[PDB]
Design a protein around this ligand. Structure first.
Ligand SMILES: Cc1cc2nc3c(=O)[nH]c(=O)nc-3n(C[C@H](O)[C@H](O)[C@H](O)COP(=O)(O)O)c2cc1C
Ligand SMILES: O=C(Nc1c(F)cc(-c2cccc(OC(F)(F)F)c2)cc1F)c1ccsc1C(=O)O
Ligand SMILES: O=C(O)c1cc(=O)[nH]c(=O)[nH]1
Length: 364
C-alpha cells in the first residue's frame, strides 16, 4: 500500500472511471470486505489519547458521512483509524436528494456534496450494529471507540423528538453520540444551532441519554458549522457550559465559497469540504476552545490531509481529529501518512505526546 502509488496512480485512475457517488459505494464495499492495502504504521504510545471517558489508540478518526449506515466499521479500524464515527442516521429511512448530489473539485482538493441525509434509518443500523456489539465492546476497551452521528428526517414535524429517538435506539450501542445540527443540506437544520432552540433540544437529548443504563450511556457531542456568527458561537459555548455537554465536533462542511476555488463545479449547491475548508475549521476550533476555556473536548474536522494539518488543529484545541475528503483523494494510505507525520512533528516540537499538544497555541 504505497502512499505515492495510491495518490499518483490508483485513486486518479479510479476517479477517472467512476463518478463520485459510485466511487463512494465501491469504497464502502471494499472496506467492509477488507480489500485494503496493509497498514504498515504501528501506533505508538505517543499517539494515545484519553478523553470522553475512553482511550483512543491514535487521534485520527474517519468523519461522519463515509460510513453513513454502519456497514464498514471493522474495515475502517483495519485502515488504521483510531476511532470510527458512522452516520448521520435518521429515524426513518429516506433516500436523500436526487443524483448527482456529490461533486469533485480536483483543482481545489475539495468536494461539494448535497446528499440530504440519505439513510437506511435507525432500525436497520441498530440491527447492523447489534450484530457486532460485543466485538465493538472489545475494540473500545482496546482503545478503538465508536461514535454514532444522529440526524433528522426531512419531513419530521418534531426535530427534538427525532434526535431523542436516535439517542434511545443507537445510544446503547455507541461510545459517543453526535447531535448533528450543522448539515447544510437539510432545510432549517442549522437553525437548531440557535440558543433558545439549542438549549431545549439538548436538554431533551441529555435527559434521554441519562435515562440509559450505565454501560450503555454514551457521551453526547454537538457537531457545529464553520459558518456561525460570533454570536452563534458564544451562544453554543454558553449552552454547552450550562447543560454540561460532553464535547464538540468542529466542523461540518461550509456553505461559503472561499475566493480562489478553481473547480468548474465550485458553484454547485451543497457543503464544501477539503483543503478550502481547513483553516476556517481550525479557526473555529480555536475560538470554541477559548470560549469553553479548554474544559470541553473538541474533535477537529475539516481539511485534514497531513500530520501538520492534524497538529495545527490539536494545537488550536482539538483532542482528536477526523478526516474524510483526504481519503477520497489519496486513498487508505493517507491514514498512516497522517499518523506518521503527526508523530514526527510532535517529537520535533518537543511534545511528549498528543495530550501535551492539545491547545498548545493558547499557552504561548
Ligand atoms: C460526501 C460527504 C458526506 C458527508 N456526510 C455527513 C453526514 O452525514 N453527517 C455529518 O455530520 N457530516 C457529514 N459530512 C461532513 C464530514 O463529516 C466533515 O465534517 C467535513 O467533510 C470536513 O472534513 P473533511 O474536509 O476531512 O471532509 C460529509 C462530508 C462529505 C464530503
Ligand atoms: O468514497 C469516496 N472515494 C473513495 C474513498 F474514500 C476510498 C476508496 C478506497 C477504499 C478502500 C480501498 C481502496 O483501494 C482499492 F481497493 F480501490 F484499490 C480505495 C475509494 C474511493 F473512491 C468518495 C466519497 C465522496 S466523493 C468520493 C470520490 O470522489 O471518490
Ligand atoms: O448528508 C448530507 O448531505 C450532509 C450532511 C452533513 O451533516 N454534512 C454534509 O456535508 N452533508
Amino acid at each position: 500500500g504505497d502512499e505515492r502509488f495510491y495518490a499518483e496512480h490508483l485513486m486518479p485512475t479510479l476517479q477517472g472511471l467512476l463518478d463520485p457517488e459510485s466511487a463512494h459505494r465501491l469504497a464502502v464495499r471494499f472496506t467492509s470486505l477488507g480489500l485494503l492495502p496493509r497498514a504498515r504504521f504501528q501506533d505508538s504510545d505517543m499517539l494515545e489519547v484519553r478523553v470522553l471517558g475512553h482511550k483512543f489508540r491514535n487521534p485520527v478518526g474517519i468523519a461522519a458521512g463515509f460510513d453513513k449506515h454502519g456497514e464498514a466499521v471493522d474495515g475502517l479500524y483495519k485502515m488504521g483509524f483510531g476511532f470510527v464515527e458512522i452516520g448521520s442516521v435518521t429515524p426513518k429511512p429516506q433516500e436523500g436528494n436526487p443524483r448527482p448530489r456529490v461533486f469533485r473539485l480536483p483543482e481545489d482538493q475539495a468536494v461539494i456534496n448535497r446528499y440530504g441525509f440519505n439513510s437506511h434509518g435507525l432500525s436497520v443500523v441498530e440491527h447492523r450494529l447489534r450484530a457486532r456489539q460485543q466485538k465493538q465492546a472489545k475494540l473500545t476497551e482496546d482503545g478503538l471507540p465508536l461514535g454514532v452521528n444522529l440526524g433528522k428526517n426531512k419531513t419530521s414535524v418534531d426535530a427534538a423528538e427525532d434526535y431523542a429517538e436516535g439517542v434511545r435506539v443507537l445510544g446503547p450501542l455507541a461510545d459517543y453520540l453526535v447531535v448533528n445540527v450543522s448539515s447544510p443540506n437539510t432545510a432549517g437544520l442549522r437553525s437548531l444551532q440557535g440558543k433558545a432552540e439549542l438549549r431545549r433540544l439538548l436538554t431533551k437529548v441529555l435527559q434521554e441519554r441519562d435515562g440509559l443504563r450505565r454501560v450503555h450511556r454514551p457521551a453526547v457531542l454537538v457537531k457545529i458549522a464553520p459558518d456561525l456568527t460570533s454570536q452563534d458561537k458564544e451562544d453554543i459555548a454558553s449552552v454547552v457550559k450550562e447543560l454540561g455537554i460532553d464535547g464538540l465536533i468542529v466542523t461540518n462542511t461550509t456553505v461559503s465559497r472561499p475566493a480562489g476555488l478553481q473547480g468548474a463545479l465550485r458553484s454547485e449547491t451543497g457543503g464544501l469540504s477539503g483543503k478550502p475548508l481547513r483553516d476556517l475549521s481550525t479557526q473555529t476550533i480555536r475560538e470554541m476552545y477559548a470560549l469553553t476555556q479548554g474544559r470541553v473536548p473538541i474533535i477537529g474536522v475539516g481539511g485534514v490531509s497531513s500530520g501538520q494539518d492534524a497538529l495545527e488543529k490539536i494545537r488550536a484545541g482539538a483532542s482528536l481529529v477526523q478526516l474524510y475528503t483526504a481519503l477520497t483523494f489519496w486513498g487508505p494510505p493517507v491514514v498512516g501518512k497522517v499518523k506518521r507525520e503527526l508523530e514526527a512533528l510532535l517529537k520535533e516540537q518537543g511534545f511528549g505526546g498528543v495530550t501535551d499538544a492539545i491547545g498548545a497555541d493558547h499557552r504561548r
